[PDB]
Design an enzyme around this catalytic site. Structure first.
Site, PDB file in Angstrom:
ATOM      1  N   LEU A 190       0.840  -1.190   0.000  1.00  0.00           N
ATOM      2  CA  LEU A 190       0.000   0.000   0.000  1.00  0.00           C
ATOM      3  C   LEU A 190       0.879   1.246   0.000  1.00  0.00           C
ATOM      4  CD1 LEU A 190      -2.966   1.201   0.339  1.00  0.00           C
ATOM      5  CD2 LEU A 190      -2.358   1.380   2.746  1.00  0.00           C
ATOM      6  N   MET A 191       0.563   2.182  -0.891  1.00  0.00           N
ATOM      7  CA  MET A 191       1.331   3.411  -1.086  1.00  0.00           C
ATOM      8  C   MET A 191       0.399   4.576  -0.765  1.00  0.00           C
ATOM      9  SD  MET A 191       4.165   2.097  -1.831  1.00  0.00           S
ATOM     10  CE  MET A 191       5.214   3.456  -2.318  1.00  0.00           C
ATOM     11  N   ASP A 242       7.452   1.712 -19.880  1.00  0.00           N
ATOM     12  CA  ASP A 242       6.395   2.681 -19.619  1.00  0.00           C
ATOM     13  C   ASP A 242       6.715   3.479 -18.358  1.00  0.00           C
ATOM     14  OD1 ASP A 242       4.094   4.091 -20.078  1.00  0.00           O
ATOM     15  OD2 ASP A 242       2.722   2.502 -19.428  1.00  0.00           O
ATOM     16  N   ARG A 284       2.465   8.648 -13.980  1.00  0.00           N
ATOM     17  CA  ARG A 284       1.232   7.960 -13.613  1.00  0.00           C
ATOM     18  C   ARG A 284       1.493   6.568 -13.051  1.00  0.00           C
ATOM     19  NH1 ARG A 284       1.710   8.232 -19.069  1.00  0.00           N
ATOM     20  NH2 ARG A 284       1.990   6.228 -20.144  1.00  0.00           N
ATOM     21  N   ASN A 285       2.656   5.982 -13.338  1.00  0.00           N
ATOM     22  CA  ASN A 285       2.973   4.623 -12.920  1.00  0.00           C
ATOM     23  C   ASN A 285       3.880   4.573 -11.696  1.00  0.00           C
ATOM     24  OD1 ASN A 285       1.459   3.474 -15.034  1.00  0.00           O
ATOM     25  ND2 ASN A 285       3.197   3.601 -16.450  1.00  0.00           N
ATOM     26  N   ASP A 342       3.636   0.051 -11.402  1.00  0.00           N
ATOM     27  CA  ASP A 342       2.834  -0.611 -12.420  1.00  0.00           C
ATOM     28  C   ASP A 342       3.740  -1.211 -13.482  1.00  0.00           C
ATOM     29  OD1 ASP A 342      -0.085  -0.890 -13.675  1.00  0.00           O
ATOM     30  OD2 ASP A 342       1.268  -0.277 -15.294  1.00  0.00           O
TER      31      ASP A 342
HETATM   32  C1  VTD Z   1      -0.188  -0.875  -5.998  1.00  0.00           C
HETATM   33  C2  VTD Z   1      -0.649   0.275  -5.106  1.00  0.00           C
HETATM   34  C3  VTD Z   1      -1.484   1.353  -5.481  1.00  0.00           C
HETATM   35  C4  VTD Z   1      -1.618   2.145  -4.318  1.00  0.00           C
HETATM   36  C5  VTD Z   1      -2.423   3.438  -4.177  1.00  0.00           C
HETATM   37  C6  VTD Z   1      -2.967   4.032  -5.304  1.00  0.00           C
HETATM   38  C7  VTD Z   1      -3.699   5.205  -5.188  1.00  0.00           C
HETATM   39  C8  VTD Z   1      -3.889   5.784  -3.944  1.00  0.00           C
HETATM   40  C9  VTD Z   1      -3.345   5.193  -2.815  1.00  0.00           C
HETATM   41 CL1  VTD Z   1      -3.587   5.936  -1.211  1.00  0.00          CL
HETATM   42  C10 VTD Z   1      -2.614   4.018  -2.931  1.00  0.00           C
HETATM   43  N1  VTD Z   1      -0.915   1.554  -3.387  1.00  0.00           N
HETATM   44  N2  VTD Z   1      -0.341   0.446  -3.847  1.00  0.00           N
END
Ligand code: VTD
Length: 281
Positions: A91-92, A138, A142-143, A159
């Site tokens: 999680l990011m 890529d 965005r990735n 990604d």
């Molecule tokens: C593979 C992945 C995507 C994300 C993420 C994408 C958008 C917003 C937030 Cl808060 C987290 N975390 N990990």
């Protein structure tokens, strides 16, 4: 069967998580989830999908699973034996880099050194990929993802959809991120990613702008082949722009590898005239 770093893996090497332990918390625009408690991101494969899709989705899990680097999102496991098919990922909380740069754009917070750390983070991941002979294909804002929006954020490549597809159309090629030999001849090497990182560097120091702002794909295609290149982003320091222009050398053999790019990004974090430059409001 997936190969990387000298080994071949398969759907078995993945860590299957029993569906019963997985709980969805949000849609993220991909979901926030829980694994019993670990906080994760859940990439879902629509049940309404073809068989090419299914194999596309499996390969991505194998690809990301074989990486071990702090600037590449971790794969926690999978839940493929139940439907819908899940990939569990780090999680990011910072979200993607393009939106972060747009929302965090200075307004009536963020400094030049922060942008260089993001650029360094991604350049470090690309070096890892290059050293392991993986071509991302890529590299773009965005990735990329951020661990957190605040200080101490870490950027990571998040990604790998493009590298899995060629492992989907002219109007869908990321033409604005591609060097001539790529969209002309379909040639891809590590020097393809170098060009793309240069464009990513322009995205970063423009604070989330679309590359070649007022141009269309075919315009860019004809612009770039003829030797045209983007201007510096507003207030961009010279040393940073010179990295971009070196990444955009017409001949791939005249472009730097990612070790040199890192080297030059680090020399920019050591220059006060660079990091003391104010961002545009
Ligand atoms: C593979 C992945 C995507 C994300 C993420 C994408 C958008 C917003 C937030 Cl808060 C987290 N975390 N990990």
């Amino acid at each position: 069967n997936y190969c990387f770093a000298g080994k071949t893996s398969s759907i078995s090497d993945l860590k299957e998580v029993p569906r019963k332990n997985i709980t969805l918390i949000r849609g993220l625009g991909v979901y926030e989830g829980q694994v019993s408690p670990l906080q994760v991101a859940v990439k879902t494969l629509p049940e309404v999908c073809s068989e090419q899709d299914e194999l596309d989705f499996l390969m991505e899990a194998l690809i990301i699973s074989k990486f071990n680097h702090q600037n590449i999102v971790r794969c926690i496991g999978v839940s493929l034996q139940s439907l819908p098919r899940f990939i569990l990922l780090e999680l990011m909380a910072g979200g993607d880099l393009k939106s972060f740069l747009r929302e965090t754009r200075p307004r009536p917070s963020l400094a030049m050194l922060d942008l260089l750390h993001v650029a360094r983070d991604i350049a470090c991941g690309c070096q890892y990929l290059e050293e392991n002979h993986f071509i991302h294909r890529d590299i773009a804002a965005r990735n990329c993802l951020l661990t957190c929006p605040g200080p101490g954020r870490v950027a990571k490549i998040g990604d790998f959809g493009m590298a899995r597809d060629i492992y989907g159309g002219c109007a869908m090629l990321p033409v604005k991120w591609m060097p001539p030999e790529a969209f002309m001849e379909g040639i891809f090497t590590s020097k393809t990613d170098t060009w793309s990182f240069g464009v990513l560097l322009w995205e970063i120091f423009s604070l989330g702008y679309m590359p070649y702002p007022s141009k269309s794909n075919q315009e860019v295609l004809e612009f770039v082949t003829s030797g045209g290149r983007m201007d510096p982003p507003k207030n961009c320091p010279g040393p940073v722009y010179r990295i971009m222009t070196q990444c955009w050398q017409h001949q791939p053999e005249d472009r730097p590898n990612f070790a040199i790019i890192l080297e030059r990004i680090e020399y920019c974090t050591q220059d006060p005239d660079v990091i003391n430059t104010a961002l545009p409001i």
